[PDB]
Amino acid sequence: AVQLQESGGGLVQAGGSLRLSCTASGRISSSYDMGWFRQAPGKEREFVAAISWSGGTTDYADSVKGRFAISKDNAKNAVYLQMNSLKPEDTAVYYCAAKWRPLRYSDYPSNSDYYDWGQGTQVTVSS
């Protein structure tokens, strides 16, 4: 029931940076994880990063290697993905997602099985 909308996509030069934003149309309650996924041309969708909405713990895909940072602003119902040192490999549609986890065992966020999805924003990194 959380409705998600991404923004910030576009063309960026290799080695460059870009910040993506995602806002939920309503309030995101305390047990959510918020995350980013991406789908490259002809490839399977894959996890990028996640953050616990109330707890702040993060998780990143190996493909990130410290180049991307996920952050949030609870007061704005927003999650962000700061992308640095962009490479052609990073060309993809980037999706904001939410996962309600009321029975979670810890604050460490999920990297799979997200249920609410944005429509995606396209990022093109030029060689």
Residue boundaries of the structural domains of the chain? 1-127
CA-closest candidate to residue 9, choices 97, 93, 111: 93
CA-closest candidate to residue 35, choices 123, 121, 116, 125: 116
Alpha helices in the chain (DSSP H): none
| Residue 70: its H or E element | strand 68-73
Separation between Cα atoms, residue 123 and residue 125, nearest integer Å: 7
Is residue 94 within 8 Å of 64, Cβ to Cβ? Answer: no
Separation between Cα atoms, residue 104 and residue 34, nearest integer Å: 14
Separation between Cα atoms, residue 125 and residue 16, nearest integer Å: 8
Separation between Cα atoms, residue 4 and residue 6, nearest integer Å: 7
Resolution in A: 1.5
Radius of gyration of the chain (CA): 14
* CATH number assigned to the domain covering 1-127: 2.60.40.10
**Tokens representing residue 114 in the block:** 């997200």
